[PDB]
């Protein structure tokens, strides 16, 4: 009762098992005193007691979970770490009851905010996949990794058996495909999430879990297998998966330099040679414009949509894979998952019908059995296609080379055609670059730095951070001076289109020009569009419009349009 | 009664957050200030999601315990001056109001109630109708209008705060040797400062901030705002003041100064306001006027 053990007295487990030793009153009181003495006293090398600084922020966020690193608990009072690894279900009860004392020392009457606090363990120093688990692991703490395959809804559950409840949710976890050995199927396990941990993860995420490994009787398993076979589950204890002023100043430094637009385009898709216009269009789509709306009868999207007609083997699928790794959020082939992101299509009636609705709208609506509901698309579409068989025909307009309705070609902001042209010098350049890249990739720090800096003019980590910063912070606008010239150019282009008997230029093209100019302003972190932005946007759209036409019309257009496609 | 902005309407959290005194005491224009407020409510034992509930519907127990909770906690934040006594009125079953809340409702109705000479005329005429929109709210039979006044007061303080943070974070205050100068060249909507009263409210915000930010240099301040229709700056001259808790009064000297530069100057200017501390001047003439002003010994 009154007397307490020394820490050295705990070195000898005196009962027949760990659990029956931890649960004794004098041992338990000793452990409680020692844990409280650790939590009030552990330090950085700089002093600066971390847990006194964490409890402080627990109340600043009105939170419920205190987080403890295992390495700190192993760095002093090692026996408590050993007992925690062996008997988590007991040790964590004592530790939670100590954590409440420590928090009330900062914030008296915190019990009125939350009645009970949970300790979360981090950095447990050994890991298993779902292969290595065996019966010896039962009731031990484990650390596991995988992909979350399926998730239930959240429900309340009765806490005690006057009443009290807690939140509950189950998650199915599967081995990551990179970990699975060759020629074997992946394994599965199911995880239980309680009060603070529900909806911490989403289906398809790759996730890391710490918790107790636990089992129970199940009648159906016994009945079907015909042997006394128990079922097992994991009870999670913790689950795992911005910028400074220095980054902002660095971004602004590079943006202040001349030619930053060209350098960003050059950094785009380093492994692919040539095809600068495709890289330009992809960069413009990833940065995008600004959305606008006028409740008097009109709305304008900020997203930029691009379509690429590809000869066989002209790098299309590689740049889509590159964009998939570059972009913040994306879908590859579902438009709900592409919300405020980029959507990627590499090959191609109901699918096309869905895309017809998606290009007309920015939000999707559906009804079924009298139910009615709505969803958001709000995304930029990058698509590629094979031109109606083995090879494109340049003598014909674009419609002859595609399996698309006319409004698709109207509503795509940018159209482009890529062809396997014949040139000895280009072939030699391609072949030299290809074998050079092949050698540079061979499995057989300084080597990496040289390789990286030869690969690109911008480090791509900085470029991804820069794209995210620009997308979240920069919102450009037009300047009202040069817009008279834009209107005159629009009228001139329409007059020339009619004069040669071309299909006419339209308001959609003018809108696309303004949107692309906004994107060009965003690329250099400029809140103003400028004359050169309008010039570049005009060149892109005019050249794209010219590429869609028949050959005789193409010659008349380029002869007249020289003062836009090349001059300004 | 508490020097908290409209306590018995909106919520307890908003009462602290928009208080003109609290902003000077805890520096709410930045996150290192806002976190102090979260920290306070956590120590006081009030769950933060209840502090944001509408004060009428907030739980009865907190309502009656609040008077003791403040005695135990405001000292640790240097914030004891919040406590004071005031007058409260109630009529039948429709609930209490204090005089401090009433005058903010009145003022709000004054401010926002609903070539160059004609536009000036139209504006000046619109401001007179609000007199009667205020007048008719002094009657217990017309509480409906008073509630509208309160709804307008909240939006006015919101818009003021969202301009004050921009002034401080971009460091637009220019620290001249004799006085402090600030000029608003642009804003989210700069029209709200075209009325004198609103301009005075913004000045009153900045003055508390300047009074508490350093112990040194109690200085006069000048505040100005441009108008795109007149191309004229509306100018106000503001005194310092001593903190609440601390002995002759000081005197506003801008009157004589403005008068003398007006008597001397080439500049195109206006002086017709009852409060002589407020003037108007055309766009190009602001800098020579202020140059002659700072060159003068009358400051």
């Amino acid at each position: 009762l009154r007397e307490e053990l020394t820490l050295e007295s705990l070195s000898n487990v005196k009962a027949n098992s760990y659990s029956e030793w931890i649960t004794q009153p004098n041992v338990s009181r000793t452990i409680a005193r020692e844990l409280k003495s650790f939590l009030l006293e552990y330090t950085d090398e700089t002093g600066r007691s971390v847990y006194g600084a964490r409890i402080r922020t627990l109340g600043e966020m009105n939170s419920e979970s205190l987080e403890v690193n295992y390495r700190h608990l192993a760095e002093s009072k090692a026996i408590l770490a050993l007992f925690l690894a062996k008997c988590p279900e007991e040790m964590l009860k004592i530790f939670d009851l100590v954590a409440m004392e420590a928090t009330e020392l900062h914030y008296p009457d915190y019990a009125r905010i939350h009645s009970e606090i949970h300790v979360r363990i981090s950095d447990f120093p050994t890991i298993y996949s779902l292969r290595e688990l065996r019966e010896s692991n039962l009731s031990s703490l484990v650390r596991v990794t995988g992909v979350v395959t399926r998730r239930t809804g959240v429900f309340p559950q009765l806490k005690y058996v006057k009443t009290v409840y807690r939140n509950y949710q189950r998650v199915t976890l599967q081995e990551a495909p990179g970990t699975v050995p060759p020629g074997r199927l992946p394994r599965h396990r199911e995880v239980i999430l309680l009060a603070d941990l529900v909806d911490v993860s989403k289906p398809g995420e790759e996730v890391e879990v710490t918790g107790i490994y636990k089992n129970n009787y199940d009648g159906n398993l016994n009945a079907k297998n015909g042997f006394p076979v128990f079922a097992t589950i994991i009870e999670a204890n913790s689950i795992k998966r911005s910028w400074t002023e220095e980054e902002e100043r660095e971004f602004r430094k590079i943006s202040r330099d001349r030619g930053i637009i060209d350098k960003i385009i050059s950094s785009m898709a380093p492994s692919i040679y040539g095809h600068r216009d495709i890289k330009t269009a992809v960069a413009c789509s990833l940065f995008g414009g600004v959305p606008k709306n006028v409740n008097g009868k009109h709305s304008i999207r900020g997203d930029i949509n691009v379509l690429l007609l590809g000869d066989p083997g002209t790098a299309k699928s590689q740049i889509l894979k590159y964009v998939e790794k570059t972009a913040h959020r994306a879908v590859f082939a579902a438009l709900v998952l592409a919300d405020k992101g980029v959507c990627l299509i590499d090959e191609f009636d109901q699918d096309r019908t869905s895309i017809h609705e998606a290009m007309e709208q920015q939000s999707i609506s559906i009804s079924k059995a009298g139910i009615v509901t709505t969803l958001q698309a709000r995304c930029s579409i990058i698509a590629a296609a094979n031109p109606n068989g083995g090879r494109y025909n340049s003598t014909l307009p674009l419609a002859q080379n595609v399996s698309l309705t006319e409004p698709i070609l109207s509503r795509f902001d940018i159209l482009c055609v890529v062809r396997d042209l014949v040139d000895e010098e280009a072939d030699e350049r391609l072949a030299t670059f290809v074998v050079d890249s092949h050698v540079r990739s061979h499995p057989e720090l300084q080597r990496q730095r040289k390789k990286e800096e030869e690969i690109s003019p911008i480090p791509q980590e900085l470029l991804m951070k820069y794209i995210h910063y620009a997308r979240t912070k920069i919102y450009p606008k037009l300047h009202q001076m040069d817009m008279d010239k834009v209107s005159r150019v629009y009228a001139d282009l329409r007059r020339e289109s009619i004069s040669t008997g071309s299909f006419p230029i339209t308001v959609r093209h003018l809108e696309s020009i303004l949107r692309i100019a906004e994107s060009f302003a965003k690329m250099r972190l400029s809140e103003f569009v400028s004359s050169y932005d309008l010039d570049r946007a005009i060149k892109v759209v005019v050249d794209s419009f010219v590429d869609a036409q028949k050959v005789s019309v193409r010659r008349q257009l380029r002869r007249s349009f020289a003062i836009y496609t090349l001059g300004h | 009664d508490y020097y908290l902005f409209l306590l018995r309407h909106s919520s307890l959290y908003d009462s602290f957050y928009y208080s003109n005194y609290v902003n000077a005491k805890l520096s709410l224009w930045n996150e290192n200030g806002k976190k102090r407020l979260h920290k306070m409510f956590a120590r006081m034992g009030i769950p933060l999601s209840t502090a944001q509930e509408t004060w009428l519907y907030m739980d009865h127990s907190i309502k009656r315990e609040l008077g003791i909770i403040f005695d135990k906690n405001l000292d640790r934040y240097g914030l004891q001056d919040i406590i004071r006594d005031g007058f409260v009125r109630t009529l039948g079953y429709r609930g209490s109001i204090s005089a401090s809340e009433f005058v903010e409702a009145l003022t709000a109705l004054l401010e926002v109630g609903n070539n160059s000479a004609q536009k000036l005329t139209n504006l000046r005429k619109r401001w007179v109708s609000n007199f009667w929109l205020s007048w008719d709210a002094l009657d217990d039979r017309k509480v409906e209008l008073l509630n509208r006044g309160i709804q307008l007061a909240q939006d006015l303080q919101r818009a003021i705060f969202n301009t004050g943070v921009a002034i401080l974070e971009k460091k637009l205050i220019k620290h001249l040797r004799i006085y402090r100068l600030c000029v608003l060249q642009d804003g989210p909507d700069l029209d709200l400062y075209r009325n004198p009263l609103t301009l005075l409210r913004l000045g009153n915000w900045l003055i508390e901030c300047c009074a508490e930010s350093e112990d040194k240099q109690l200085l006069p301040m000048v505040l100005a705002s441009i108008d795109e229709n007149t191309d004229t700056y509306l100018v106000a001259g503001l005194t310092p003041r001593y903190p609440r808790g601390l002995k002759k009064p000081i005197l506003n000297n801008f009157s004589m100064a403005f008068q003398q530069i007006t008597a001397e100057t080439d500049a195109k200017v206006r002086i017709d306001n009852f409060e002589s501390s407020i003037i108007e001047i055309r766009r190009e003439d602001l800098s020579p006027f202020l140059e002659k002003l700072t060159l003068s010994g009358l400051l």
């Binding site: 009030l40 006293e41 330090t43 002093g47 600066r48 007691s49 847990y51 006194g52 600084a53 402080r56 020392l105 900062h106 | 920290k39 640790r76």
Partner: peptide
């Protein structure tokens, strides 16, 4: 107690700052 002073210092810095 001197060893636990760093904890109480982190608590008191809320008073100071």
């Amino acid at each position: 107690n001197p060893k636990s002073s760093a904890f109480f210092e982190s608590m008191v810095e809320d008073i100071i700052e």
